[model samples]
Target: KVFGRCELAAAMKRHGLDNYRGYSLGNWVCAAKFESNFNTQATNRNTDGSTDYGILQINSRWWCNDGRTPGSRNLCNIPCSALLSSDITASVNCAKKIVSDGNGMNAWVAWRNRCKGTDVQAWIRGCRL
Candidate 1:
């Protein structure tokens, strides 16, 4: 299911992204907007052949084992398909692992280019979180 902006914010907060690793909810929401547009089933293939999956668009090469990305790491220890579902718990958990590893949300290019060091309040303007 594609989530409304505020809905996605609330959902992400529920799953523990609110200020996780010092990144605000707005930061996560703004990244999600550009990464997958809130689409749970979104997927993208990179030029180097790695596939990104789900709303967070986690890469197969590092986060999930798609059995396709060369030297796939499965850092989150889950299947790539697990990220492409309405149940975003896995996605959120994996995302936490990403920032928990200390790279911060900059691990995602969308967050770097769009939300980082910017006024992301608009991403969560109407949200009750």
Candidate 2:
């Protein structure tokens, strides 16, 4: 399911992404704008054969058990398919593990190019908190 920008921002904040690993709620919203465009079912196949899944684009290589990646770690302890749901809880939960691993928001390519070191409030500024 796809989400409205403000809806995703508020939902994510509710689910524990606010200031996670030093990245603000706005940063997460910014990342989703570029990474998945608020589309929870987005997917991107990595050249190495791992597939990115869901709005946050959590990868199957280590985060989720897609049963496709050769050395899948399943660190989130969930099937990659769980990320595809619009509930946003699993995706939000899985994201903390990924960032808390010390990678921070840098784990996401879009965050670096778009959200990192920037005034991310612009991403959610016009919306209601």
Candidate 3:
């Protein structure tokens, strides 16, 4: 789950979604651990059976904030953040909004550098200590 965050961030910056994209390796681990308990294989579904898949639990059926289908081709196999048509901040913010609304994983989203500010600096920097 942590590797996924860095890989996602790198992929996002490469595809031009977020700026100032850099977070420590420890931060990723902590975020994923706290949020999903390191269960990358976890899954959650809504009343309609729309399910969030894999470690990030990204809902393929409805996490369409960027106007793209969250398919394996776009999200699972490849980092979806890189395939985004917008900037990194917008995409991450969108994820933040989704996760914070209790619809997705918040700890995973918090690993983003911007979200790693004082609010979560301890988690972001804890692993280093």
Candidate 4:
């Protein structure tokens, strides 16, 4: 729903994600880029029957409730649908808590597979964040 990379970066910055848990803005940008292409409504079902929700693709097993899962931790205390929206406050807050729990950017598989150990700087190269 944004104009692309720059817009996404701006929004993230505005949300105070410029620096979180000592991770740079680049990490967040790259993670978002690979996770859901900055689409807040993005959702994916994993082979393990757990689904990923929203821009961060948070797992249903621990973070938010997707309705079908019964024993979800629901640590964020929010419905999965809350993450599937333009309003990212809830998403960002949940993600921060996830990082605080010691996962850091490693919480996202996209970060581990694509953004990790790569040229993450390029994610915010043209963005004036």
Ranking by lDDT: 1, 2, 4, 3
Candidate 4 lDDT over 1-129, as tens digits, reads 432787877877888788888877788888988888888888899877778888888888899988887666899999989988888788888888898897788878889899889987788897776
Cα lDDT listed for each candidate = 0.93, 0.90, 0.41, 0.83
Mark the 10 consecutive residues where model 1 has the least summed lDDT.
120-129
Candidate 3 matches the true fold with a TM-score of: 0.36
Find the candidate with the highest lDDT and give its number: 1
Score every model by TM-score: 0.96, 0.96, 0.36, 0.92
Models ranked on TM-score: 1, 2, 4, 3
Per-residue error at 71 for model 1, in Å?
Answer: 1.2
* lDDT of candidate model 3 versus the reference: 0.41
lDDT of 1 by residue, 22-50 (tens): 88899999999999999999999999899
Error of 2 at 28 (Å): 0.2
The alpha-carbon RMSD values of the candidates against the true structure, listed in the order shown, are 0.9, 0.9, 9.1, 1.4
